């Protein structure tokens, strides 16, 4: 079945958990440092830190005051 | 050519 992303926000002029301008959430970034290594053509590699996104973003209905 | 008009139908 289709996903249902937002739990009802914290509970002119209608107080609806729905019908609120939706924003998207933030992706999660994780950094891995690679140990210096060598390769078949005998080159020594010092990469640094590689950052990758573990989770894609998801929709969110803002809490309404 | 009286009353004759130029009607070119293009393909």
């Amino acid at each position: 079945t289709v996903s249902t992303t937002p739990p009802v926000s914290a509970g002119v002029r209608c107080d609806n958990p729905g019908t609120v301008h939706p924003q998207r959430s933030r992706d999660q970034i994780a950094t891995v440092w690679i140990a210096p290594w060598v390769d078949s053509d005998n080159a020594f590699h010092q990469p640094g830190r590689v950052s990758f996104v573990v989770s894609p973003a998801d929709w969110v209905l803002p809490a309404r005051v | 050519r009286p009353g004759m008009m130029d009607s070119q139908e293009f393909s």
Binding site: T1, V8 | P2, G3, M5
Partner: protein, 217 residues
């Protein structure tokens, strides 16, 4: 600047000016002219045009009557008086429309939305679809606002959706207003108030149908 729209009746005669030096055009919206007849040696050249259209050029200097017959058995007459000037376009229209086409809604709704709708309708009718079978109502399936008391009534479940009906009971003895969004519980797909009544008073016992997800993930 704009075609001269002329709605004359069937067999109608409309006197209109035409140009004796430049071609003139007559077209019927929604119809394709099939034939055009005029006194012999008045209209020198007649040509069919994309859709239903007749481009005619007349060198004559005398008023004459011209008959146009369309493809749906419509015949209209026109009295044409040639005059020096610009060619004139005429939009011939029927007087009283013969038939009324009922245009079907072309719009189609999303599959998931239909699935929720059908089930709710079936539960309301009481007919239970083939896949669905009866089971135990869930103990707490909805949020209870303002002192409401819920008693499990009935439920049926199937491969991808499940349904529960609960009877609401009002102990408040106050005038309450229903908003289906209040009865939301993390994991609900839809809430239906069987009686479409905005406000429940004390002992307002509306029954609400909620479809959640069987096999929830």
């Amino acid at each position: 600047q704009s075609p001269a729209t002329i709605s004359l009746p069937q067999g109608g005669q409309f006197r209109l000016s035409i140009s004796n030096t430049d071609p003139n055009m007559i077209f019927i919206p929604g119809d394709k002219v099939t034939a055009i007849t005029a006194p012999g040696g008045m209209l020198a050249d007649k040509r069919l045009t994309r859709a239903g259209g007749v481009l005619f050029t007349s060198v004559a200097t005398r008023t004459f009557t011209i008959f146009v017959e369309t493809a749906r058995g419509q015949t209209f007459s026109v009295v044409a008086t040639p005059v020096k000037g610009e060619g004139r376009v005429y939009r011939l229209m029927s007087a009283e429309p013969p038939s009324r086409p009922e245009t079907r809604k072309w719009e189609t709704a999303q599959a998931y939305e239909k699935l929720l709708i059908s089930l709710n309708r079936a539960v309301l009718t009481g007919d239970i679809p083939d896949g669905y079978g009866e089971v135990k109502p869930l103990s707490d399936g909805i949020r209870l606002p303002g002192g409401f008391s819920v008693t499990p009534l009935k439920a049926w479940a199937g491969d991808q959706l499940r349904a529960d009906r609960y009877e609401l009971r009002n102990a408040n003895t106050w005038g309450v207003a229903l908003r289906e969004q209040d009865f939301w519980k993390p994991g609900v797909r839809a809430v239906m108030f069987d009686n479409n009544a905005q406000t429940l008073m004390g002992g307002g016992r509306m029954t609400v149908t909620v479809i959640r997800g069987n096999g929830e993930g």
